[PDB]
Amino acid sequence: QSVLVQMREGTPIGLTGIYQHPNPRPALIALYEATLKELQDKHPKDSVYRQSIENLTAHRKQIVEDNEVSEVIENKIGAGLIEEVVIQAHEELELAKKMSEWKPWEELEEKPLEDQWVYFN
Amino acid sequence: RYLQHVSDLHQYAKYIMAALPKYIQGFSVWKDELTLHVAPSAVIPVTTFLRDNTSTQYKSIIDITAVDYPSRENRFEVVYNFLSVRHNSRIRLKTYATEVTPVPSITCLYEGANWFEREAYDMYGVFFEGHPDLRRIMTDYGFEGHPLRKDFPLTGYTEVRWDEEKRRVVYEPLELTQAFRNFSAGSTAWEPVGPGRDDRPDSFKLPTPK
Amino acid sequence: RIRAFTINFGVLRLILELSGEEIIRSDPHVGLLHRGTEKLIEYKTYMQALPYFDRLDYVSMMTNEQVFSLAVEKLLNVEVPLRGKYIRTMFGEITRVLNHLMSVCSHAMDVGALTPFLWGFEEREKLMEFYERVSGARLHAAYVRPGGVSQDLPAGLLDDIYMWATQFGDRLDEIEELLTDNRIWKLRTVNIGTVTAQDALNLGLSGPMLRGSGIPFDIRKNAPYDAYDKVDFDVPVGMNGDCYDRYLIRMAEFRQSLRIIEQCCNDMPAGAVKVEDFKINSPPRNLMKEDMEALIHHFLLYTKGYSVPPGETYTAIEAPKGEMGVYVVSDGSERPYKCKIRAPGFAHLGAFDHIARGHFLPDAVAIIGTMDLVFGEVDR
Amino acid sequence: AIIATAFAETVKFSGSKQELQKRTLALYRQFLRGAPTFADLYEVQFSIPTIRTKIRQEFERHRFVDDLSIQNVLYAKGHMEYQECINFWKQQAQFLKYFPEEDDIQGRHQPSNFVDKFLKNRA
Amino acid sequence: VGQDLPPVGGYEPVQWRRNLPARGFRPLVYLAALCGICGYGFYRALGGIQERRELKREK
Amino acid sequence: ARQGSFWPVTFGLACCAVEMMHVSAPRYDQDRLGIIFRAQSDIMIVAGTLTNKMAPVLRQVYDQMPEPRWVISMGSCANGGGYYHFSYSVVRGCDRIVPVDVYVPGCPPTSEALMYGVFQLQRKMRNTKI
Amino acid sequence: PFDLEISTLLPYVMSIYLVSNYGFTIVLLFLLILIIGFVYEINTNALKINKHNKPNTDSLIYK
Amino acid sequence: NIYAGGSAAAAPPAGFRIHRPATWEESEEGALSKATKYFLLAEMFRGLYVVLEQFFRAPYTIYYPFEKGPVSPRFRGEHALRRYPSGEERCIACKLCEAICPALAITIDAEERIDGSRRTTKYDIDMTKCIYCGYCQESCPVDAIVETPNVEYATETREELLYNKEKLLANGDKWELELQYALDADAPYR
Amino acid sequence: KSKYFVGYDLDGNSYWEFKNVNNPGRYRRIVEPAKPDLSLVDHKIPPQWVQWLRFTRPHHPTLEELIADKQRQELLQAKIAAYEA
Amino acid sequence: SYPTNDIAENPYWKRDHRRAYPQTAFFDQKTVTGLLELGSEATPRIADGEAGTKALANIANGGVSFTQALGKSSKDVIYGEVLTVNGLPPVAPTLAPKQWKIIEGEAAIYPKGYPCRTFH
Ligand SMILES: CCCCCCCCCCCC(=O)OC[C@H](COP(=O)(O)OCC[N+](C)(C)C)OC(=O)CCCCCCCCCCC
Ligand code: SF4
Ligand code: SF4
Ligand code: SF4
């Protein structure tokens, strides 16, 4: 199934270019479940990245799943508006999908020279 | 507050290095400023992580530039500046690039960045691989050289005057009526400042044994 | 095949490719006023590098002076006194009043309204008298040094700043009355130059244009400086991303800065205006003579200058054009190793052909005057 | 800036020498094909064959360059110069930077031997 | 000593709000006046047309 | 007619262009003799720093003027380079490009000094009697 | 065709007294036939010139 | 509480969700009342009236060749080398004004006489490149160079614009009493 | 304008002020040149009064002060030639 | 003012702020492994002061790696000094946090109908 994360036409809210999203909570929780499924499937369980984003979207999804109205959860999240929260959840989801192929949990591949991060000391 | 806050910034950056160990070489803080020390093939993934994470959403390129130290084998260092307008935070990203090798361009992510990248190109000759409209800006069109570079002199190589004969302006090697007199020769021969104290919190410097 | 013809639309060259009336792509040239001011300050001390900043962005000169004399102060680890902080706050705010008094009444001329440009100039003349009585020359006041503020106020100046602030509310409401409600003004500017809130960020925009689109951010209230903390201040932020709301935010910032000028007149304390020591700024010429050490310090601050700890900083403040930062790198010597400005209009003109697509050709003129291009900024 | 300008290409760095040779080949074809435009555009005095033999002798200057990435920067600079020349961005006094030896003979006494250098102490 | 200071009581507060005192009448009042002055004008005009027609009869 | 009306095609290109517009401001009008700086006449005014890029553009604007022509150089960046005299991309005064007849010195030379330069130039134009 | 109905209207305005009650209705019908072609062109948005400045406001669809 | 992470106490403020724009039927004025403003150009005549108010008041304009605008004592215009009372040149060849100038306009040649006192053989300011920062006034310990408040000195050649020692001593000769008055009135604040 | 006389200089010009403290933006001090020479725009104004025109010197200068100024410069010339010797 | 230029008790070094400047806390790839394994001057994990320096010196020579330091790290280490104490990533920190009012009534600078709000 597909999900819409940002209406570009509708009634206006304070941020221009961003209009009011119909039914933001099912979009939100399905996008969350995609985040949880991707980082459980593709990142190895040592790595700090998947651990904090797992805990992050779990604690974020708990607020969405357990409270109903618009304004109270957009205060309890503490980030922006719910349209904007859906956009940044979409964004961290696309990030977590790029990280499975860019693979950041390795050791570093390009060691610096010893005389390079030396400024004036 | 401010002591607590700089000690908080230290810990945030320790987390940023631990989240991406393949790409981040170092981090340094100096007075509520955070610099991330990144390889040149490591630019694009770190910048996507800075744009995209919810803890780390910087969204907005402010200004980028290079700086040359000719005393290093990798000559230029290319520094990026970002601003999370949500979290009210600034972050800095330094890579390196020799005169001849590139650094990859972040203009796929940041839309304002391309104009900055060709500015730093003309001032420094630093390449941005993957960049539409890489060419000079804010210098002369036929200008040969890169100005903000330590081998390039102050007054440059050429000058402009109207030749009567050709009925056009002509470009000629440099002749001055008054030579430039730098007064940098005549600086102090004593060390001017001490080493200075540190602002490292007690939690992030190495323990002494016993 | 669409065939677009090209035309050669301060000093600025700007290529337009037109399919009839519509702009399909636009390409601003820049560089015809690039004079190399970023490389020259590497060969001059900081006391000598100070006028290179009212050379650039000359309309609001004290704010451009201030951003360098804040990056230096942060890199020095010194502290301007309290009287210095209020004094630099209110001169930066009459500088804001001057910049918007030019920018509003020049967007009004480019659109076509000819009365506010003339009316604005008379008001501006009173402000250039306020500069002329404080520094020597008008339009290039070097008055904020890096150590602090160059010299003390005149004897009867604060009274005249109040005498101006009384009438200026009425003379601002007067120019406001015939533009804000005006149908031609409103018609030509409600759907022109709209900027979405996500693309206001990716273009690197700031100031009145980032606050046009709805995002509440300004460096005066977010990361304050220079006794803008100690002085009460609201900020206006518009809804739609158009050019009318950028106009409307400017119209509001006149009133907010008049409020700051009044609070700075009333809450002004007594104190020293320069920093206390004399290894970074000059002794008074009273006791430069009589003391031996002050003679020594005078001679060394002028033949050499003061020396700065090694390091790097990026200090950014809110110029009335937008976020203006400066990035200075200190060798540890008395000449800066490298120092780049972030001109605010640089990314405003860089954002042009993402904003000005699909607009008419006179719709490419009203969009100019609210991205506020003075071109001491954009080339530099 | 989403769209690029007219004749631009995304600057991209080849990993082989033969692909670079193909690109410089296509590049010389572009200069040589656009050479009749430059005489009309910049209002030069002289003939199109002199423009063409100059484009040739400016690629003669870098024929024996070994290093791959120096050939790479040299290609990028040549494409930037084509980009400026094919439009009207350069003017007719910066297009004639390229021809200083053609326009006028400066006078007598071009020194050749050590004596003619030395009578005006190497000029 | 000698530097300038604010007065000890402080200055009086300046006007930084918007001063737009309403000075137009109600729009229906202007429209009622417009309809009245029009209708009186048409009274005079069509009366003049009828009088000019009677003079044309006489000529 | 040339005396009593004087319409300089202004080349205000930097800092001094606003000081030139302070003549067009209600204080220092010069509305009365008849100089109007609001905009094919026979004088131009170079005011601000003349870069490397612009010297052909300056000469091309100076070329398409009617023949009995003059030019005054306002500011210090427009005569002998000025503040930016040792920069690489700058013309050290427009004496390298255009033949200038009066100089108005000052880095921001006050509308006082610019207008006084114009009066000196009008005396020169009348003593010509071409 | 809108300048030229005006000159079809010019002979009525001189002779308005003679054609009383009858040339009235003929002119009214003439104008009322012209108004429907006028409302044709203003229903069809004929003079308005359009451009491509809208991003078409399509919502962002995922997966 | 604890915040979500990726998230701070900078939530959206209470009321940042702005209301729906009201339709035509949730408008307080009638369509006839709105059309009276629409057709009779209600705010056009208001802005017409403002410019007519400005027509009947007394203008700001001043005569230049017979009146000069308001100036400060600390104003800066053409240079001058001062002198002492009882006639003495006061520039002691101390070389500070040359070392500070941000545009390198000063050029001084210094030579010492038999007397042991120090003066300048050749003093020089290039006024094509002086930028009027007044640092040269601020640096000289003996108060020997100043900024006279003259601005009306526009010249016709550049060779006239190269000020040597003789021209600046003449400028210190002519402007003296107003110069001394301005420096004495400035002197508390320096 | 409602003229007052408030000075006669050395050179011959009449220094007139009018419409005083009423209006802020009122230009207050003007000079009659006494020489309406046709199209001629030079007037040698002595340097002491120029400051009085510029709102910097509030106190009125006298004519005897001007002639003493000129005599001061002339006597200084003999002093400077003696010192150069 | 006078307390800066008193004649009794003003050593220059007490009011001195140019020399008491902070230094850039630069952190290598390796000194962060040292922070994860040796511990800290707040919470040390090192006894045997003679064999302490020996356990320090292999990390200073490149003995263990950073991914190995993260694999060998306990959950108390990871939730104490890498992550927050609630297992959350830290927020991008700001010096003086800014909480926003929205002024709405007659104290606003534009009434309802104009699109500009006047936040605070
Ligand atoms: C559409 C309109 C409907 C409303 C009608 C109400 C009008 C009041 C009746 C008064 C009649 C009267 O008594 O006036 C009579 C006058 C002429 O007067 P006389 O020359 O002396 O007549 C001669 C006397 N004999 C006959 C005995 C010899 O004729 C008029 O011009 C009145 C017209 C009123 C103006 C209507 C125009 C409305 C605006 C239309 C533009 C949109
Ligand atoms: S002459 Fe002076 S004020 Fe004028 S543009 Fe040049 S530097 Fe700026
Ligand atoms: S005023 Fe400035 S530029 Fe001029 S001589 Fe003095 S220090 Fe130099
Ligand atoms: S004017 Fe002052 S700084 Fe210059 S040589 Fe004379 S005493 Fe020295």
- What ranges do the domains of chain C cover? 5-371
Q: Is H132 in the pocket of ligand 3 (CB under 6 A)?
A: yes
Pick the CATH number of C5-371 from 2.30.30.30, 1.10.645.10, 3.10.20.30, 3.40.50.150: 1.10.645.10
Query: Is the distance from the beta carbon of residue H81 to the nearest atom of ligand 3 less than 6 Å?
Result: no
Q: What is the DSSP letter of B131?
A: B
Q: Is F107 annotated as a binding residue?
A: yes
Ligand 1 atom having least distance to the Cα of E50: 20
Largest CA-CA distance found in chain D, in angstroms, rounded: 61
Q: Decide: J42 and B202 in contact? Cβ < 8 Å.
A: yes
Say if CB F49 and CB C55 are below 8 A apart: no
C184: enclosing H helix or E strand:
helix C183-188
CB-based contact, B23 to chain J, within 8 Å = no
The answer to whether the Cβ–Cβ distance between A48 and B23 falls below 8 Å is no
Contact exists between I and G (3 or more beta carbon pairs < 8 Å): no
In this complex, which of J15, J96, J114 lies closest to C276 when CB atoms are compared? J15
φ, ψ of residue C24 in degrees (nearest 5)? -100, -35
| Ligand with smallest separation from the Cα of C11 | 2
Cα J72 from Cα J77, distance rounded (Å) = 10
Query: Which residue in I75, I60, I76, I81 sits closest to I8, CA to CA?
Result: I60
Give residues with Cβ within 8 angstroms of H184, minimum separation 6: none
Nearest to J109 among C76, C238, C252 (CB): C252
Which secondary-structure segment (H or E) carries E53? helix E27-58
Contact indicator for B92, B33 with CB cutoff of 8 Å: yes
* DSSP-assigned letter for residue G9: H
For H19, the token pair is: 């209301």
User: Residue whose CA is closest, atom 19 of ligand 1?
Assistant: E47
- Ligand 3 atom closest to Cα of residue H125: 5
Q: How far apart are CA C177 and CA C180, in angstroms?
A: 6
d(CA C215, CA B60): 13
Q: Smallest Cα–Cα separation from C212: which of C182, C188, C192, C232? A: C192
Asked if B touches C (at least 3 Cβ pairs < 8 angstroms), the answer reads yes
Selecting from I39, I40, I42 the residue whose C-beta is nearest the C-beta of F3 gives I39
The residue length of chain B stands at 210
C-alpha distances (whole Å) from B184 to each of A112, C42, C334 are 33, 10, 9
User: For an interface test with F, which of C35, C98, C117, C121 has the most F Cβ atoms less than 10 Å from its Cβ?
Assistant: C35
Residues of H in contact with B87 (CB under 8 A): 8, 10
Q: In which element (H, E) is residue I63 found?
A: helix I63-84
Residues in contact with A61: Cβ distance below 8 Å, sequence separation at least 6, in sequence order: A29, A32, A33, A36
**What residues in G contact A31, CB-CB < 8 Å?**
62
The answer to the question of whether F15 is labelled as a binding residue is: yes
For residue C188, how many C-alpha atoms fall within 13 Å in the half-sphere facing its CB? 21
CA dist C315 and C309 (Å) reads: 16
Strand G61-62 versus strand F102-104 pairing type: unpaired
For residue H125, report the distance from its CA to the centre of ligand 4, in Å.
12
User: Are C153 and E14 an interchain contact pair (Cβ–Cβ within 8 Å)?
Assistant: no
G55: nearest Cα among A31, H1, A9: A9
Place of tokens 């045997």: J48
The minimum CA-CA distance between C79 and chain E, rounded to whole Å, is 21
Residue B94 to residues B30, B48, B66, D92, Cα–Cα distance (Å): 14, 15, 9, 41
Q: Using an 8 Å Cβ cutoff, are A58 and H8 in contact?
A: no
The number of C-beta contacts closer than 8 angstroms across E and H is 20
Find the domain containing J35 and state its range. Answer: 1-120
Pair J100, H13: CB distance under 8 Å: yes
Q: Which pair of structure tokens corresponds to residue D81?
A: 């110069």
Nearest to C99, CA basis, from C319, C360, C348, C367 = C319
Residue labelled with tokens 């020194």: D111
- C-alpha torsion sign, points B192, B194, B195, B198: negative
Name beta bridge partners: B84. Answer: B89
H130 assigned ligand-binding residue: yes
Q: Are the C-beta atoms of residues F83 and F51 closer than 8 Å to each other?
A: no
Pocket lining: H133 vs ligand 3, CB cutoff 6 Å: yes
Q: Are C10 and F18 in contact (CB under 8 A)?
A: no
Contact across the interface for H72 and C136, Cβ inside 8 Å? yes
Do chains D and F touch by CB distance (3+ pairs < 8 Å)?
yes
Report yes or no: F49 and F90 within 8 Å, Cβ to Cβ.
yes
Strands (E), chain F: 9-12, 43-47, 70-74, 102-104
Residue B36: enclosing H or E segment and its boundaries? strand B34-38
Distance in angstroms (rounded) separating the CA atoms of residues C195 and A4: 22
Cα gap H129→H133, rounded to integer Å: 12
Considering all CA atoms of chain I, what is the largest pairwise distance in Å, rounded to the nearest integer?
A: 57
Which chain H residue's Cα is nearest to F110?
H151
Within 13 Å, how many C-alpha atoms sit on residue D14's CB side? 18
Residue J90 is given by DSSP the state P
For J31, residues 6+ apart whose C-beta sits below 8 A from its C-beta are B206
Q: How far is the CA of A113 from the centre of ligand 3 (A)?
A: 47
Which chains are within 8 Å of E by 3+ CB pairs? C, H, J
Q: Of the candidates B40, B34, B131, which has an alpha carbon nearest to the alpha carbon of residue B82? A: B34
Q: Do chains G and B touch (3 or more CB pairs under 8 A)?
A: no
D: neighbours with 3+ CB pairs under 8 Å? B, C, F
> Is A107's CB within 8 Å of B86's CB?
no
How far apart (Å, rounded) are the C-alpha atoms in residues H79 and H136?
Answer: 10
* Distance of alpha carbon H128 from alpha carbon H123, whole angstroms: 16
**C82-111 and C157-180 helices, crossing angle to 10°:** 30
Residues contacting ligand 2 via CB (< 6 Å): C 55; F 14-16, 48-49, 75-77, 82-83, 107-108
Residues of chain J found within 8 Å of residue A117, distances taken between Cβ atoms: 26
DSSP string, A31-71: HHHHHHHHHHHHS-TT-HHHHHHHHHHHHHHHHHHH---HH
Query: CA-to-CA distance for F31 and F24, rounded, in angstroms?
Result: 8
**DSSP string for C147-176:** SS-SS---SSHHHHHHHHHHHHHHHHHHHH
DSSP reduced 3-state for I17: strand
Closest-CA distance of chain A to residue C169, Å: 29
Cα of H144 from ligand 3 centre, angstroms = 13
H18 shares contact with chain A (CB less than 8 Å): yes
Interface residue ranges in chain B relative to chain C, Cβ cutoff 8 Å: 30-31, 33, 35, 59-63, 65, 67, 79, 81, 83, 85, 88, 90, 92, 109-116, 119, 123, 137-140, 147-148, 154, 182-184, 186-188, 192-193, 196
Identity of the residue in H29, H36, H188 whose CB atom sits nearest the CB atom of E30: H36
Q: Are C133 and C157 in contact (CB under 8 A)?
A: yes
Supply C359's token pair. 């607009």
Q: Could you tell me which residues come within 8 angstroms of residue A112 by beta carbon, excluding any fewer than 6 positions away? A: B25, B26, B37, B39
Q: Is J116 on the interface with E (CB under 8 A)?
A: no
Beta bridge partners of C15: C8, C27
Residues pairing with I14 in the sheet: I8, I32
**In a mutagenesis test of the C interface, which of H78, H135, H148, H179 is the best target, namely the one with the most C β-carbons within 10 Å?**
H135
Task: Identify which of B88, B111, B148 has the shortest CB distance to residue C223.
Answer: B88
H175 labeled binding residue: no
What resolution, expressed in A, was reported for this entry?
3.3
Listed residue (A64, H62, B79) closest to I26, CA to CA:
H62
Which experimental approach was used here? Answer: cryo-EM
Q: Which two tokens stand for residue C314?
A: 């990026």
Token reading at I4: 């007052």
* Closest CA in chain H for residue F115: H64
Q: Where are the beta strands (DSSP E) in chain C?
A: 5-8, 14-19, 22-28, 311-319, 322-330, 336-342
Polymer length of chain I? 85
Query: After which residues does chain D become discontinuous at a C–N distance over 2.5 Å?
Result: none
The answer to whether the beta carbons of residues B180 and H103 sit under 8 Å apart is no
Tell me the C-alpha distance between J113 and C245, whole Å: 13
Distance C295 CA to ligand 4 centre (A): 14
Q: Is F77 annotated as a binding residue?
A: yes
Are the beta carbons of J32 and B196 separated by less than 8 Å?
no
Nearest CA in chain H to E30: H36
Measured between alpha carbons, how far is F86 from F96 in angstroms, rounded to an integer? 15
What is the Cα–Cα distance from I80 to I76, expressed in whole angstroms?
Answer: 6
Interface C–H counts its CB contacts (< 8 A) at: 82
CB contacts of H72 in chain I (<8 Å) are 56
